[PDB]
Write a protein that binds this ligand. Structure first.
Ligand code: NAG
Ligand code: NAG
Ligand code: CA
Length: 322
C-alpha cells in the first residue's frame, strides 16, 4: 500500500488507476510534545541527593536542574544516546512516603497515528511496580485505559494477569493487565507485534490475513490508533521487598527512553504525511481533504465520503471522492 495512483495501459488507452495507500512508518518519538505532571515531580528544584549504582550507600549523587551535567529534564527520554551513556529523566525521591510517588507522562502528536510496532519504555533504576498506559483519540479531551502493569494485577486493579500473546482473534483488541514487566531487564512493553501475530503468525508471514482482519474485524484497526499516550506511573521499583523507611533516597523513577513506532492515520488515501502548519498532516489523494483525509474536497461531494480499503488484496480499494 505504498502507491496512491499509477499511469496504466487498459483496453481503452492510458489512464490513472488509484489504490489504497499508507504513509511510511516513522520514529514517532521525533514528533512528540511531552508534558510531565504534577509540577515539581522532576528532581533538582530544589537540589536533592539520591542513591545511584556508583554510590549506593553514601547516596551523595545530586540532581540539580540548574546544572546541565546534573539535570534530568523530560527531553532525555527522547534523545540519541552514545554507547555506555544512557540519559534519563528522573523523578524526586520517595521522601514523602507513605504518600504515593506518582508521575503522569503525556505524549502528544496532535495527529491521529497508528502503532506498527511495540511501545518500549526503558527504566534505569527499576521498572514500576504499578503503572497504567492510557490513550486518547481526541487530543486529550478524553482518556481510556490501553494497558495495565502490576507486580500483582489482582491486588492493584482487580484484573487477572494476561499476555497479548495469549489472546484469540476475537479478543486481540482487549485492554489487558500484565505482570511480565513489573514482577521482581529495563524494558516495559506495550505489545503491538504480538497482537499482529494473532492474525499473521509468530513469523508475520501471513500479512494477507492481518490486512483482511484490519478491514473486517470491528474496532481492530482503531485499537492501534491514537492522538496521545499517557504513562500514569503509580508505584516505583521495590526490589522485591517492603519500602526501606531509613533510605527513601533509593526510590525514584528514571526513564532513559520511550520508543514509539508507527505512521499517520490517512484513511488509506495518502502515502505521504508531513509537517503542515506546525503539525503532522496527511498529503491527501483520492480527492480527499482534512488532516486525516476524513472528508471529500469541496467540488467532489457527489457521493458520501468513504475510507480506502486494504481489500481486495494486494492493492485494495481507493474509495475516492467523486
Ligand atoms: C494523573 O491523571 C489523572 C487523570 O487522568 C488525575 O486524576 C491524577 O490525579 C493525575 N496524577 C497526578 C499525580 O497528577
Ligand atoms: C494541531 O494541528 C492542527 C493542524 O492539523 C493545527 O491547526 C493546530 O493548531 C494544532 N494544535 C496544536 C496545539 O498544535
Ligand atoms: Ca535518553
Amino acid at each position: 500500500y505504498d502507491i496512491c495512483k499509477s499511469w496504466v495501459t487498459t483496453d481503452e488507452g492510458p489512464t490513472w488507476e488509484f489504490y489504497a495507500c499508507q504513509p511510511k512508518v516513522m520514529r514517532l518519538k521525533d514528533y512528540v510534545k511531552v508534558k510531565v505532571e504534577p509540577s515539581g515531580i522532576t528532581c533538582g528544584d530544589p537540589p536533592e541527593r539520591f542513591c545511584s549504582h556508583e554510590n549506593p550507600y553514601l547516596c551523595s549523587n545530586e540532581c540539580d536542574a540548574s546544572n546541565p551535567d546534573l539535570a534530568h529534564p523530560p527531553r532525555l527520554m527522547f534523545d540519541k544516546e552514545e554507547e555506555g551513556l544512557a540519559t534519563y529523566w528522573q523523578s524526586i525521591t520517595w521522601s514523602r512516603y507513605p504518600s504515593p510517588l506518582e508521575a503522569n507522562i503525556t505524549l502528544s502528536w496532535n495527529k491521529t497515528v497508528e502503532l506498527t510496532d511495540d511501545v518500549v519504555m526503558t527504566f534505569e533504576y527499576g521498572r514500576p511496580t504499578v503503572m497504567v498506559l492510557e490513550k486518547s483519540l481526541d487530543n486529550g479531551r478524553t482518556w481510556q485505559p490501553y494497558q495495565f502493569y502490576a507486580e500483582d494485577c489482582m491486588e492493584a486493579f482487580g484484573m487477572s494477569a494476561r499476555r497479548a500473546r495469549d489472546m484469540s482473534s476475537s479478543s486481540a483488541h482487549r485492554v489487558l493487565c500484565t505482570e511480565e514487566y513489573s514482577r521482581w531487564e529495563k524494558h516495559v512493553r506495550f505489545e503491538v507485534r504480538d497482537r499482529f501475530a494473532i492474525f499473521a503468525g509468530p513469523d508475520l508471514r501471513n500479512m494477507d490475513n492481518l490486512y483482511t482482519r484490519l478491514e473486517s474485524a470491528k474496532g481492530l484497526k482503531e485499537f492501534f490508533t491514537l492522538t496521545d499516550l499517557r504513562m500514569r506511573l503509580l508505584r516505583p521499583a521495590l526490589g522485591g521487598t517492603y519500602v526501606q523507611r531509613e533510605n527513601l533516597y533509593k526510590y525514584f523513577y528514571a526513564i532513559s527512553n520511550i520508543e514509539v513506532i508507527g505512521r499517520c492515520k490517512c484513511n488509506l488515501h495518502a502515502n505521504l504525511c508531513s509537517m503542515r502548519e506546525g503539525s503532522l498532516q496527511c498529503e491527501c489523494e483520492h480527492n480527499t481533504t482534512g488532516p486525516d483525509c476524513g472528508k471529500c474536497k469541496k467540488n467532489f461531494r457527489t457521493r458520501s465520503w468513504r475510507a480506502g480499503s486494504y481489500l481486495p488484496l494486494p492493492h485494495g480499494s481507493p474509495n475516492a471522492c467523486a
